[PDB]
Design a protein around this nucleic acid. Structure first.
Lengths: 173, 88
RNA sequence: GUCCUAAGGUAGCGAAAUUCCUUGUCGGGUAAGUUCCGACCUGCACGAAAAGCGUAACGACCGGAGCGCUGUCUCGGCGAG
RNA sequence: CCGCAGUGAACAGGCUCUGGCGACUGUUUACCAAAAACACAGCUCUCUGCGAACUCGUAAGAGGAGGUAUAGGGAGCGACG
RNA sequence: GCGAGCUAGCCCUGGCCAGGGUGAAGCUGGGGUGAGACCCAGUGGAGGCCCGAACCGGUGGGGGAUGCAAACCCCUCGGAU
RNA sequence: UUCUAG
RNA sequence: CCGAGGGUAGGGCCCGUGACUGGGGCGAAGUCGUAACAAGGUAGCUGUACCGGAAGGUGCGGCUGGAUCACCUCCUUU
RNA sequence: GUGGGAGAGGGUGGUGGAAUUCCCGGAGUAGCGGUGAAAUGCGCAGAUACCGGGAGGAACGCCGAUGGCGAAGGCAGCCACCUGGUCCACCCGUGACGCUGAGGCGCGAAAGCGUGGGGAGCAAACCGGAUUAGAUACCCGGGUAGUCCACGCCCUAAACGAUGCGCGCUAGGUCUCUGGGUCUCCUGGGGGCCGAAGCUAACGCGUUAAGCGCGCCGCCUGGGGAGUACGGCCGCAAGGC
RNA sequence: AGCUAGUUGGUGGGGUAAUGGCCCACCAAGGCGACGACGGGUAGCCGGUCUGAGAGGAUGGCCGGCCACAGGGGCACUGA
């Protein structure tokens, strides 16, 4: 419903309980309200799995318990993640419903290796974080916009195209 | 899997006479029990087509034993079906 | 059998709205049909990606034909405002 | 039972047979042209790891996007087969 | 320097689509097999879906051409959650 | 590599 | 009212039938090539897939209705 | 029933080296690689060979076998999870509960298709090099779809033992595996070989019958056209019945 | 590979020598089919005949039985 919310933990020792299935319409991410100890909440990432009955978190400590997330430092090798913590705390550093996250495919000193979900590879840094678990996007792909144009229903630009025009109009155009 | 003492509590359950180690009452009870944790196994493990075919033989083994008791005494056949719960 | 080129048109299609020689030649439709529609295909100059052959439904799109019906027409002739 | 007539007057599809293009509802050149023109759902190459890449901007800055490679921009075609 | 009370857009915020028709997901029940596939019947009510007012339009013909008018009147037509 | 029929 | 027959329309079963065109069989014999039986010369046949004037070829699978000792590993036994 | 036993039957997850090709560093030359001999090709921007590191699929050597399982196709590095079939001994339990099977219903090579990953290597197509008369093929150097997996679709074949299933009757010698026994051998299953009777037109089958007898099944009945045309069912199609 | 509206049965009833959905009313819906229904192709059926070692093949004109048609298509009369 035209809004944002959470995206980056950094208060821990906190109790992570899988709020609920609030599959969400606004970023290809499907998240559920994450119930913290105090009671303070957050429509959190959609890293598939972690059943309703919440039951997680993270921590400077550990707990690969699927989903959840800590610094690079605190992370296995051969592991699949998201909550792409690029720079030191820059919260998320990639993978948006981009299921196929990154896989600490080898780390090095204040530098941890990452399979570039998108489609390449290089390294991050020290404390830098990132929570494993999948994504959530049920292949958020495909699906037919049949005899109409989902598009429009887009609210998402018919910013339509052209290319053939009659003129000689717009940038590199 | 099927436990050995589970098998006996089933044989004891269905026996009309103390010592019924093998009879219509036991066969069907065995085969039906073997049918419900083999089919349960095939729902996950979708493609176990070798053990599915070996099940179906056993499916046909049941029916023919069932056939016999209706052929002779359909009175205890109605008692054997309801108790187990097969046919629909 | 060759001379040149970077190789030198392939599958589908074809007188198509790319074929001026042309109302091309054969077929059907007709009392005759240079429009159609089928088929040949020497494609004046189709062709796969500004796609190529086809394709149910779909079109105030374009073109071809049959029944129905009327002054559209065989000249109309009367009338009402 | 009656008149030539019995939706009685009044508002109310002509249908069919075929072909070509574009699939389709569309949208558009206000005062000629609504179309085989764009649009498309859909495909393919493809620049881009963020403080993105391209667009405005004299330097800020906004946009992008509080998006983050099932994504954002560049594109030639434009179901499906 | 002057302008979106022209028009093309885009942001924000309200209002508006008389009637009718077609009958997909589903859920209820019944249906030969292990469960099912899956069938049928009921319910059910989607779709830039159909038939049509207002409303949006302005092909196809009629008038008008010092007009009623610097685009309008007439018959006609498309769209119609 | 090829060299008809009776 | 039922109905022989007549009419317009709608479909179904079939015979004829056509420019043209796919193939199939004859026929003295024609051209171009070697596919096949001796490893037919690359052993052949096959399901299939692509490609090649044409026989065919190459690939994935396989069957031998494949066979020699012209070579290796050894096997099996007094 | 019970009590053992074997196995590459299956399907889910998981881990293990061996090498293969590409990538970063070391070292270190002038050639490699390749055939019937060459050539195309790589390489002085330093290749081939060796050292070390990496990443990645894909198979899975020896054991492994003329051996094993399985309804048919077909199935092999170790791991555990569900699970099928099938075999000796006790002779306990039911009590003829059976044997064949139109259609169906399910499986089911490999090619292929549908979408979604992945692609180290192999490899039609296509590309060069050779070749000959000619080279659209053999031979050499490249390389794409596929080959890989999930999921759904095809179901075809020298699908072979070219030979339906069941039971029961008719010498043997011998090799091997599995299960039991008084385990110099007897026993029940299973696999290879020779061989009496017998069948055979021919080879050859020969208690693993192509012998002798009983059920029930499918298929035959001249060669090409044909396994094709046409009607029908099925697939996205290539096709398929 | 599906077939069916007088179609399957029933109540009453017309008509007939009288049974019968035979024709009609009203009622409920079943009746059929691979033990080949619906459809298509073709047809006089038999005693007998020809052939055959036979079982079985063919065939059934004149003599005989039952049946059909009277150019094609129907209907009623008189009437045992």
């Amino acid at each position: 419903q035209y809004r944002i919310i959470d995206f980056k933990r950094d208060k821990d020792g906190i109790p992570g309980r899988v709020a609920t299935i609030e599959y969400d319409p606004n970023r290809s991410a499907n998240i559920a309200l994450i119930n913290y100890a105090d009671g303070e909440k957050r429509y959190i990432i959609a890293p598939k799995n972690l059943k309703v009955g919440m039951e997680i978190m993270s921590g400077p400590d550990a707990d690969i318990k699927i989903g959840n997330a800590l610094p690079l430092e605190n992370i296995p090798v051969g592991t699949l993640v998201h909550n792409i913590e690029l720079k030191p705390g820059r919260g998320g550093q990639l993978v948006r419903a981009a299921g196929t996250s990154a896989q600490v495919l080898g780390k090095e000193g204040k530098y941890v290796i990452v399979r570039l979900a998108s489609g390449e590879v290089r390294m991050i840094l020290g404390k830098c974080r990132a929570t494993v678990g999948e994504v959530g996007n049920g292949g958020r792909t495909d699906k037919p916009f049949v005899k109409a144009g989902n598009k429009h229903h887009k609210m998402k630009a018919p910013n339509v195209r052209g290319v053939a025009m009659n003129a000689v109009d717009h940038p590199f155009g | 899997p099927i436990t050995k003492e589970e098998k006996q509590k089933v044989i004891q359950e269905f026996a009309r006479f103390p010592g019924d180690t093998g009879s219509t009452e036991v066969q069907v009870a065995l085969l039906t029990l073997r049918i419900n944790r083999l089919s349960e196994h095939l729902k996950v493990h979708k493609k176990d087509h070798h053990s599915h075919r070996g099940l179906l033989m056993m499916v046909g083994q049941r029916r023919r034993l069932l056939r016999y008791l209706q052929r002779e005494d359909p009175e205890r056949y109605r008692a054997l079906i309801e108790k187990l719960g097969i046919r629909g």
